Amino acid sequence: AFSVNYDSSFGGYSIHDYLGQWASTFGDVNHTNGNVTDANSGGFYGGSLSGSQYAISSTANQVTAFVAGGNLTYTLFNEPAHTLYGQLDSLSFGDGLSGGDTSPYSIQVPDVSFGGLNLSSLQAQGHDGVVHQVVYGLMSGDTGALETALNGILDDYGLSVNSTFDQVAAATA
Ligand code: HEM
Ligand SMILES: [Ca+2]
């Protein structure tokens, strides 16, 4: 049930080119050994360490953001430590994060959204699970794991992340 939604200015962009611009604007939140605070942790909606959404804003520019949606839980110090797992079904990208407390997170100026991703991983796969690799890559400004997961969805339509948004819409609508 894969779907894409995009501002019409991105119709002629490849998926890869959009995500490359998004990543280079968002930068890298450096959520790493020795550098984690409240500033670069992001947050969940629906719980403190789990919920229907996870979202985070750029520490470089304070506005660029992404919202990950589905059913997600982070183990924090439970084994395997520091793993995000569960189901990742949507991702949205753009500028400005609001909500996240008594209402869901949303992006204030949305560029692109993917729905129906159907990505699922179990706790026991720890950091090798696809949902962990995708979202921790995004937090780090690395879209390599998401593109790999999108190529695996797209190959069934004969497309890839080198296809443009308009080419994907014509195959999926
Ligand atoms: C849900 C998305 C998240 C992912 C994918 C994630 C991923 C990670 C990873 C891979 C590490 C370990 C080692 C390293 O970064 O070099 C880590 C460390 C850590 N994370 Fe997260 N994290 C997430 C959210 C959070 C949140 C919401 C908190 C809240 C406090 C948090 C707190 C920490 C702490 C305290 C550490 C250890 C820092 C240290 O050992 O110096 N993480 N996280
Ligand atoms: Ca440490």
UniProtKB/Swiss-Prot annotation:
The keyword Secreted applies. It is found in: Secreted. The lineage of its organism: Bacteria, Pseudomonadati, Pseudomonadota, Gammaproteobacteria, Enterobacterales. Heme binds at H31, Y74. GO terms for cellular component: extracellular region. It comes from Serratia marcescens. One of its GO terms (molecular function) is metal ion binding. Induction: By iron depletion. InterPro entries: HasA_haem-bd (IPR010495), HasA_haem-bd_sf (IPR036912). The keyword Iron applies. Keywords: Heme, Iron, Metal-binding, Secreted. Monomer. Can bind free heme and also acquire it from hemoglobin. Conveys heme from hemoglobin to the HasR receptor which releases it into the bacterium. HasR alone can take up heme but the synergy between HasA and HasR increases heme uptake 100-fold. This is Hemophore HasA.
